[PDB]
Design a binder for this molecule. Structure first.
Ligand code: CL
Length: 163
């Protein structure tokens, strides 16, 4: 585990992360996909061998020795708010289990079920809180990756509030 387990947020490409493993915002089919998923495919294509896994689950595939945790959030275009919220909480719990199993000291993570899977809604607070509920019991340094300046400020604030 990390010496003083922390949360941080960085506004850059998660494919350039400085952590011991990465969470992919995967699709259920293990396809190259778009957004974070496409950057992950371009950086760690080997990790997409038998990566396909259902909604609300996480499946780790090693690129060399570097773990890629394919976390499948619900697409809110397809799910009801109620069922989406449940599968989004589940995907984060499976990430916590895989990060623990791997014994890594740090993990790079995007906010699941945002952008292409948000159903056109701002789910920053929803997704971030399910991230906290899962990862709070873990001892890994968590680094959250986003691309939009207003998202970084809001994520930074939510982290610092609890400190
Ligand atoms: Cl970048």
């Amino acid at each position: 585990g990390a010496m003083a387990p922390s949360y941080r947020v960085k506004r850059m490409d998660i494919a350039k992360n400085d952590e011991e493993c990465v969470v992919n915002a995967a699709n259920p089919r293990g396809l190259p996909g778009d957004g974070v998923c496409k950057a992950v495919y371009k950086k760690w294509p080997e990790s997409f061998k038998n990566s396909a896994t259902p909604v609300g689950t996480a499946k780790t595939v090693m690129c060399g020795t570097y773990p890629v945790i394919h976390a499948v959030g619900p697409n809110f275009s397809n799910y009801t708010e109620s069922e989406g919220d449940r599968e989004l909480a589940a995907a984060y719990r499976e990430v916590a289990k895989e990060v623990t199993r791997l014994g890594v000291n740090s993990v790079a993570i995007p906010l699941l079920s945002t952008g292409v899977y948000s159903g056109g809604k701002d789910r920053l607070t929803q997704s971030l809180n399910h991230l906290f509920t899962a990862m709070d019991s873990t001892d890994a340094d968590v680094v959250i990756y986003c691309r939009d300046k207003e998202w970084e400020k809001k994520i930074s604030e939510a982290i610092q509030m609890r400190t």
